[PDB]
Each structure stands twice: as structure tokens, then as C-alpha cells.
């Protein structure tokens, strides 16, 4: 019993995390095999990011300008280049501690942990979710960029994120392991704040989903929807068009609860007119989104308790 | 910015965890140098479970009789012993991944990681609070026995809980890693309830902290409070009494906001008296208690390990 936001165990990325400096700049970066990924910011001064010309910045740099610390131990870069928004440093030793691993860009509503760093030190582990407007609502302070998200399903690392900076409204924005910035945003100071964000739908259906298995049903109601009923009402509380793939997706909650997807859409339907009367679902007053359906599915018991 | 139920790094107590087997029963072991501990009832059958007799289900057991398996590899059992609910598995070899580490005992009130294990391989980590009743709000599922808790101080792991049970309102117990439980809780099949629980006062106060330190400041407010005054109202909401202590604690944090501990109790008074009015505080509409003042000022300074 119990649900709580949990986040993979971090020991895999953690035995990855190193400090790399250029000029004034310290930042984090990821090390696996023998390249060093990091954000290309790391060359830039405060004025370079108005408008940087990374290829410039660049090219004036050596391999020896680049400082790479693993712990205690100083590694020596022997190549360097630019994918994207990342640099990738060529190391000359490979990472003894590298796990399985591979780079994934994920879409949003999908949930990963981060692991917060400083200097190439580990400070905390914490869940979170890309959210529709492509920014995550982390919590980072300055000399955060370079620690990244990632999944560990069945003991490879599914890297899928990598910081790169703060928003004015305090959310987070940042690439895939390719360098690929997630959303509309770039790598220079300039006004981009984040779109108006909303709710997905389908993680909301995924931690009721939840709150039944745990053995909860107050919120159910004797009514059913039709799909498109449904994203009518949901549109005007500012929450995501639910699609037949998040149908789809929802089945075995369904299947374990009994519960019909469009059934269960009637409920949050309610829950949205009256909100809770008092009441919470899994400690929670608010209706919670960043759990999603393969995330109920791990941490929940395959029982309901009826 | 932003402000996350953190976690401590997981990797140094990853190393340690192993799967413990006894005849039909399976679950985890922390490995440290050449010992293993884990849940004495990992002895026990369903029937032995109403009334254990810990001392003579032991002395029935040999050595070979445990399986201890480090990943893929069966360590050997050299020794045996009780410490209180702890079993203590001598092994042939020593955990080369030790952490330097201590056996600390926890206050209600403070808080802990958790890295949830089944089979001896880790799950997932989240954060929790020993609760003003003893109890711990976790997500466990059969198969987390042994599972631990622990905060990071330095380099040094300060390993504070081990699983040992879940309640019938969903809510866990266990010990400390000298086998000793908190709460009146004991390990057998029996009527055991959670008692009636309480709010985290210096918690509270800690988070509202946390949030104006985020922007959030709608609920401050001209008014301050004497600490008698305060705690009259507290003990009517069910909150935990406020201490000279906890104001004390609470100084490193009201010295970064400009914010005084008893003018920041005037704005939780008249939280507990109106509610929220349709607002949140850090993106939470009820008030959030399972951060410490420390977990405040570590989040927001970036203390690394
Ligand atoms: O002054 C700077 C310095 N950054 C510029 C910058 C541009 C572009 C790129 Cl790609 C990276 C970066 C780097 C950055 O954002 N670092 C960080 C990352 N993660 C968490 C931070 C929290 C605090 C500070 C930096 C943080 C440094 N950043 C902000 C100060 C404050 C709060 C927000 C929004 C502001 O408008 C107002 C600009 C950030
Ligand atoms: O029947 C048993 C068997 N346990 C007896 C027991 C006694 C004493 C001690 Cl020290 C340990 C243990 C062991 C235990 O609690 N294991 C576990 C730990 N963490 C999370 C569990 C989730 C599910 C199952 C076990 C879980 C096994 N457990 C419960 C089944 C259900 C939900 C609650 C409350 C119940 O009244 C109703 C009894 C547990
Ligand atoms: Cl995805
Ligand atoms: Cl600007
Ligand atoms: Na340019």
C-alpha cells in the first residue's frame, strides 16, 4: 500500500556525473565510454548570450581548454565537437563505471527522475514530467545545467533529458542527449517565455486509476462519456485533448479495476465541476498528472483491493 | 527555482543491498563489510507469525540454511545472531562497495530516503517523514521487508530505518538498524493499529519558508504571535506543540527570508483558521509537512554528496 513519487534508484547516472570547466564557466557533465556530453553554453560568457555565435566561440578553443574532473582525477580531452546544443568532449579514458544505456527523446506527459548536480557532485534525486508545453518544473539553482533525466526500465539507463536553463516563470527548459532542445526554446538570453500550460489528462486517469487500485472509489459516479463529450469539457478546465491512444494506453488500469476508461472520464468530468468537498485521493487535494499509466502499472500492486 | 519532494543520491546504499532466503521466504538484506542484516521474521512460517518465539525458530537454523545472493553471486553464511528484531548474518565475504557509514536513530519529525527493494534489487527512491506517531507514510508492496532508510552527511551514509511491516490503514513500520522499532509496534500477526497522527509544525513552517524563498508570499501578513498564543491554536488543528527549539531551528531560515519564526506562526494561525481560499503554496493546496527546516536550506543551497 501507499503511492509516492518515486524516482529510479540514481547509482547508474551518478557513477556518470563529472565537472567540466571552461574559462570561469564550471557546469556539469555526463560521461559514458569515452566522450564527455555536455551543454555548448559552457564556452559562453554572460554577454556572448545575447546573441552567441557558437561556431566562432569555438573554434578558438583547444582540447586543453577544456578541464574534465571525475572525482579527484583530472581527465585529459583529446577531441572535442558540437551536436546540436551539446559539446561532446573526447576523453582519453573510458568510463569504468558506464551502465547500459541508450538516449531516448521522449514526448510530453512521459515521466523521468532527475538527478540534481553541482559541480559534477550529486545533490538529489526527484521525479518529474515533460510537461504539454515542453518545459519541466524542476528545481535547479545556478551550476545545475549539464544534470539529467533519465528512466531504468529493466536495468538500462534511458537518458533522456540534459538541463540547460531557468525560465522566467521558474520552470526549466533543456535537450535530448543529441542536443535537440525540447520545445521551441534556444540557448541564448532572449524573450521565449514558456506557452500557457495545461493538464494531462491521461496521467490524471492513470492516478485515479491509482487511487481504485489502493482501494479508494468516493470519486465514481453511475455515469459514462462519449470521447469527444469529454475533451469538450475537459478543453474549458485547460486540460489535454485525451486521444484513442490514451485510451489505449489506459486498458489494463482498466482491465485490473473494471473500470471503463470512458467511465472513469465521467468521473474526472465530476471531479472537475465539484472538486474534492473536503476530501483527498492518495494524500493529495489537487488532482495530480505527472504519474502515468506505466508508472502506476510499476509502483501499484497488480491486486485491487476491492 | 522550483521546489520537489527530494531524495538523497541512492548509489552508496544500491552496493549494499542483497536477497535473504529462509525456506519459502524472500527478502532484502543490507551488506556492510562481512555482515548482513535484515527482519528477524525472516524465520518465521504464516503459523510461527501469531506467537514467534524468535530464540527457538533461531537456534533450529543452521548456517546453510540462509541464501544470501549479492547480485549474481551466493555469499556464504559463516555465523548467525539476534540484535532485537535485526538478524545478523555473518558472511564469508566482505562488501567491497561499503560506504562509510554509522547506525543512527531517528526523531518523529525527520525525514529519510527510501530506496524500496524486492529480491535484493532496487525499485525506486522517494522521500519520507517518521511520523509524530511512528509510523512512516511508504509505498510497499509484499517482498519490501529489509528495504532501508537513510540520510547522506558528507561522504557518510546515516542509515536510519529498516521495513519491517504495513498497517491496516496502509501506513508502515520497522526499525532502527539495531532492531529496535519505532512505535509500539512489535513483529507478529496480531491486532496493531496506527495511532492517532499529528501535523509537523516546525515543518510546516519550514515549507512556508521554502515558498516565499520560491515568490510565494500571499499569506504573509502585518500581524505576529506569542509562542503560547500560537500553540493554543495549534493544539486545536491537531499540530504538534512549537518549541523554543523548533523557533531556533528555524533561525539560519527566517535570517535568508527577513521573516521572523513567530510572524511567519501569524500567517499559519490565519492559514489554519481560513484555508487556502482557493489558492496553493507550492503548487500544493493542503499544508505540506514531511520538510525539515534542513531540507529547506539543503534543497535551496545545492549541497552536494
Ligand atoms: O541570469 C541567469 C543566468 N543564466 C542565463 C542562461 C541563459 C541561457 C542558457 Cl541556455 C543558460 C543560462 C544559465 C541558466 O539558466 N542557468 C540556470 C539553470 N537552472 C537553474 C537556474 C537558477 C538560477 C539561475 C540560473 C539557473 C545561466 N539566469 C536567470 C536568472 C533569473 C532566474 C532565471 C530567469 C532569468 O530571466 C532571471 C535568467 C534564470
Ligand atoms: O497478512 C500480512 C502478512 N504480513 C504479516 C506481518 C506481520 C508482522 C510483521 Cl513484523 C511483518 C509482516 C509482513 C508484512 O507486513 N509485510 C509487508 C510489508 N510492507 C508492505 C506489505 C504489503 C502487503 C503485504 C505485506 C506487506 C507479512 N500482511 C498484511 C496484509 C494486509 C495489508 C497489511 C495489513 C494486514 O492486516 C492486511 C496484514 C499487511
Ligand atoms: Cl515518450
Ligand atoms: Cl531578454
Ligand atoms: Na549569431
Redesign the interface.
Same mark, same amino acid.
Given at each position: 500500500?501507499? !503511492?509516492? $513519487?518515486?524516482? !529510479?534508484?540514481? /547509482? $547508474?547516472v @551518478?557513477?556518470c556525473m563529472v565537472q567540466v570547466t571552461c574559462g570561469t564557466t564550471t557546469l556539469n557533465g555526463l560521461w559514458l565510454d569515452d566522450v564527455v556530453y555536455c551543454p555548448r553554453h559552457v564556452i559562453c560568457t554572460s554577454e556572448d548570450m545575447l546573441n552567441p555565435n557558437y561556431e566562432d566561440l569555438l573554434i578558438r578553443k583547444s582540447n586543453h581548454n577544456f578541464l574534465v574532473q571525475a572525482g579527484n582525477v583530472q581527465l585529459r580531452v583529446i577531441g572535442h565537437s558540437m551536436q546540436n546544443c551539446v559539446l561532446k568532449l573526447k576523453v582519453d579514458t573510458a568510463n569504468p563505471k558506464t551502465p547500459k544505456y541508450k538516449f531516448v527523446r521522449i514526448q510530453p506527459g512521459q515521466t523521468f527522475s532527475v538527478?540534481?548536480?553541482? *559541480?559534477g557532485?550529486?545533490?538529489?534525486?526527484?521525479?518529474?514530467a515533460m510537461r504539454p508545453n515542453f518545459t519541466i $518544473?524542476?528545481? !535547479?539553482?545556478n /551550476?545545475?545545467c549539464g544534470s539529467v533525466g533519465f528512466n531504468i526500465d529493466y536495468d538500462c539507463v534511458s537518458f533522456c533529458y540534459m538541463h540547460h536553463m @531557468?525560465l522566467p516563470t521558474?520552470?526549466?527548459a533543456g535537450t535530448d542527449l543529441e542536443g535537440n532542445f525540447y520545445g521551441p526554446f534556444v540557448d541564448r538570453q532572449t524573450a521565449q517565455a514558456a506557452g500557457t500550460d495545461t493538464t494531462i489528462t491521461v496521467n490524471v486517469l492513470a492516478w485515479l486509476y491509482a487511487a481504485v487500485i *489502493?482501494?479508494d472509489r468516493w470519486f465514481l459516479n453511475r455515469f459514462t462519456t462519449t470521447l469527444n463529450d469529454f475533451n469538450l469539457v475537459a478543453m474549458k478546465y485547460n486540460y489535454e485533448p485525451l486521444t484513442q491512444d490514451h485510451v489505449d494506453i489506459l486498458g489494463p488500469l482498466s482491465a485490473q479495476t473494471g473500470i471503463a476508461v470512458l467511465d472513469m472520464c465521467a468521473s474526472l468530468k465530476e471531479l472537475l465541476q465539484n472538486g474534492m468537498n473536503g476530501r483527498?485521493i492518495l494524500?493529495?487535494?489537487?488532482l495530480e498528472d505527472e504519474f502515468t499509466p506505466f508508472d502506476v502499472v510499476r509502483?501499484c500492486?497488480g491486486v485491487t483491493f476491492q
Open positions: 500500500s501507499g !503511492f509516492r $513519487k518515486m524516482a !529510479f534508484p540514481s /547509482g $547508474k @551518478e557513477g538527478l540534481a548536480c553541482y *559541480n557532485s550529486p545533490s538529489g534525486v526527484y521525479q518529474c $518544473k524542476g528545481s !535547479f539553482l /551550476g545545475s @531557468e521558474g520552470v526549466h *489502493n482501494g483527498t494524500g493529495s487535494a489537487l509502483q500492486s
